[PDB]
Structure 1
Amino acid sequence: ETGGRMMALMEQQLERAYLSNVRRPLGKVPAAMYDVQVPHSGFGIPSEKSES
């Protein structure tokens, strides 16, 4: 028997604190432990320019 929706939501809320759910989620890259900023053009060095 399932105790409805609130119990299920709290049950899933108590789950993610497990280390397995943190470093091994389903079909996803594990979350970062610090903030990252994606540049406007993307990652990597821009190509260096030269005089015409």
Structure 2
Amino acid sequence: ETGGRMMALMEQQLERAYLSNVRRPLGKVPAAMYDVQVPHSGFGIPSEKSES
């Protein structure tokens, strides 16, 4: 028997604190432990320019 929706939501809320759910989620890259900023053009060095 399932105790409805609130119990299920709290049950899933108590789950993610497990280390397995943190470093091994389903079909996803594990979350970062610090903030990252994606540049406007993307990652990597821009190509260096030269005089015409």
Indicate the TM-score class for this superposition, using the shorter chain for normalisation: over 0.9
Q: What percent of counterpart residues are identical? A: 100
Q: Deviations over 1:1-38 (max 9, x none)?
A: 00000000000000000000000000000000000000
The answer as to 2:32 corresponding to 1:16 is no
Q: Which runs of 5+ in 1 are unaligned?
A: none
Hey, what's the Cα distance between the residues in 2 that align with 1:33 and 1:6?
29
Two-structure CA RMSD over aligned residues (Å): 0.0
Q: Which runs of 5+ in 2 are unaligned?
A: none
Q: How many residues align?
A: 52
- The TM-score with structure 1 as length reference comes to 1.00
Hey, what's the Cα distance between the residues in 2 that align with 1:38 and 1:4?
40
Hey, what's the Cα distance between the residues in 2 that align with 1:48 and 1:12?
50
Runs of 4+ displaced beyond 4 Å: none
